[PDB]
């Protein structure tokens, strides 16, 4: 129970957890430093409600959109890369998302990939970000061997890692239930972003490495904080939404500052 004090919303959610009526794609208990799987699920339900409320306000939707745009751009230019491609892919990704008629199909795809809830957390934070990080945490058998090769120039290691990323993304694209849907639109973004992150987390640049490491650190810390009952109030939905919003702005400012925007 640690420092957990009695909270209305939290206990309401915990009821559901004990019934078994709260679902999740991947347990993030240890990563997000929760007390237990039960604790994680309760807080998860609460966070879902919080974002569901938060994203009705169009100002906040704009905040998150703009934030994503700027942070990925900053990462890209700090990787000595041009952000134009990513900017366009991101943009029409959003324009596709805003179309209300796309959403049943999107629901089908995401459910087909294990997403158990149409929520900002489930889609953007868990399915898109934390999965990307968990992916670049464990590169293929082959890639690593190419990386520990003393004889290869690191320009070659660059193009090699790029090729590997494209190969993985290709195998993923082959399994698309829909050619031009949510996950495809996202696979283009991934096409323009994943190589950079990969060569940051695995490459020997050592200044791309620091930037990437700190980027990931900021995101993961943001999520940890979001699941911290002492950082945010799991008492009511309006209060949790207020706290999560402020946390978002804070950590955003921090990351922007680090990237030099
Ligand atoms: C430091 C940390 C800072 C905070 C984190 C910032 C994260 C930035 C996220 C930017 C997108 C916000 C979308 C706002 C609209 C919304 O949220 O839509 C919430 C809806 C549920 O609501 P709805 O269906 O009822 O309709 C809502 C009205 N449209 O589901 C969604 O998610 C759909 C939106 C999906 C957008 C995907 C964008 C992917 C960006 C990937 C970045 C590159 C990563 C590459 C990794 C290889």
Residue numbers in the entry: 307 to 567
What do the authors say?
We obtained crystals of the zebra fish Miga2 LD targeting domain (residues 310–568), which we refer to as zMiga2. zMiga2 shares 74.9% and 76.1% sequence identity to human and mouse LD targeting domains, respectively. A crystal of zMiga2 diffracted X-rays to 2.85 Å resolution, and the structure was solved by single-wavelength anomalous dispersion (SAD) using selenium as an anomalous scatterer. The zMiga2 structure resembles a “mug” and consists of eleven α-helices. The central six helices of the mug surround a large cavity of approximately 1100 Å3. Intriguingly, inside the cavity, we found extra electron density that seemed to correspond to that of a glycerophospholipid, although no glycerophospholipids were added during protein preparation or crystallization. We modeled this as PE with two 16:0 fatty acyl chains, since PE is the most abundant species in bacteria cells cultured in LB media. The central helices are amphiphilic with the hydrophobic sides facing inward; thus, the cavity is hydrophobic and can accommodate the hydrocarbon chains of a glycerophospholipid. Side chains of helices α3 (F370, M371, and M377), α6 (F426 and L431), α10 (I525 and Y528), and α11 (L561) make hydrophobic interactions with the first hydrocarbon chain. The hydrophobic side chains of helices α4 (Y396 and M399), α6 (I429 and I434), and α9 (F488, F492, I495, V499, and L503) contact the second hydrocarbon chain. Based on its structure, we found that zMiga2 has a positively charged concave surface in the handle region composed of helices α7 and α8.
Mitoguardin-2 (MIGA2), a mitochondrial outer membrane protein, forms the ERMCS in higher eukaryotic cells. Mammalian MIGA2 has several distinct domains: a mitochondrial targeting transmembrane domain (TM) at the N-terminus, a coiled-coil domain, the FFAT motif, and a large C-terminal LD targeting domain. Here, we report the crystal structures of the MIGA2 LD targeting domain and the major sperm protein (MSP) domain of VAPB bound to the phosphorylated FFAT motif of MIGA2. MIGA2 (yellow orange) forms a complex with VAPB (gray) via the phosphorylated FFAT motif and then transfers lipids between the membranes by extracting and interiorizing lipids into its large hydrophobic cavity.
